[PDB]
Amino acid sequence: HHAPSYRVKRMDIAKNDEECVVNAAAPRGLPGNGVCKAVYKKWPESFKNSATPVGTAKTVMCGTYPVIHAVGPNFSNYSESEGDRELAAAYREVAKEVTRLGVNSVAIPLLSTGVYSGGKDRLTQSLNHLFTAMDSTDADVVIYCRDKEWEKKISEAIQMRT
Numbered sequence: 001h002h003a004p005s006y007r008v009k010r011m012d013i014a015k016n017d018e019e020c021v022v023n024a025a026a027p028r029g030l031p032g033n034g035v036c037k038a039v040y041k042k043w044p045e046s047f048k049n050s051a052t053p054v055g056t057a058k059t060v061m062c063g064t065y066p067v068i069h070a071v072g073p074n075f076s077n078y079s080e081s082e083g084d085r086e087l088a089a090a091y092r093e094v095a096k097e098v099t100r101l102g103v104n105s106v107a108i109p110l111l112s113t114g115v116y117s118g119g120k121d122r123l124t125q126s127l128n129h130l131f132t133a134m135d136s137t138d139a140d141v142v143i144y145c146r147d148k149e150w151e152k153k154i155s156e157a158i159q160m161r162t
């Protein structure tokens with residue numbers, strides 16, 4: 001039957017064409033300045049009781065549209081080793097929620113690569129944890145980014161596995 005795919009698009013994740021969205025969220029459920037800024041503007045209702053611990057995900061419906069609030073670690077606060085573990089765990093919880101929801105597709109950003117990156121380039125680290133979690137799901141995954149060079153690198157990483 002249908003072949004599950006990965007794609008990357010360089011555009012605002014709030015404009016996605018998928019059946020649900022992943023917010024790069026904060027543990028206290030507060031609006032932020034990255035992805036979460038766009039998510040709060042588009043789906044403010046999904047922030048009712050969206051607070052959840054680092055390394056977890058919590059889904060809140062906006063109408064019937066699921067917003068999966070996934071909380072990556074802030075690497076300014078976490079050690080490299082503990083932050084790596086929590087980043088991986090957040091994506092594992094996203095994969096479980098995508099499965100539970102039965103969606104055919106999900107729009108997802110790269111967790112902990114912006115406000116929570118500790119000032120380091122974490123594209124490969126974050127993308128590889130995304131793959132480790134989402135590879136075993138059969139939803140179409142669309143990765144959203146904003147940087148031109150990151151779009152190219154993410155696309156290369158997807159393509160080199162096919």
Ligand SMILES: Nc1ncnc2c1ncn2[C@@H]1O[C@H](COP(=O)(O)OP(=O)(O)OC[C@H]2O[C@@H](O)[C@H](O)[C@@H]2O)[C@@H](O)[C@H]1O
Binds near residue numbers: 036037111
């Ligand atoms: N609207 C967007 N669409 C797609 N990608 C985006 C968007 N906005 C930012 N990005 C990119 O998404 C990636 C994740 O960065 P952040 O959204 O800043 O997420 P994170 O690093 O996990 O920090 C989360 C923290 O920031 C606050 O926005 C949020 O409330 C939380 O406190 C970065 O590469 C960023 O450049």
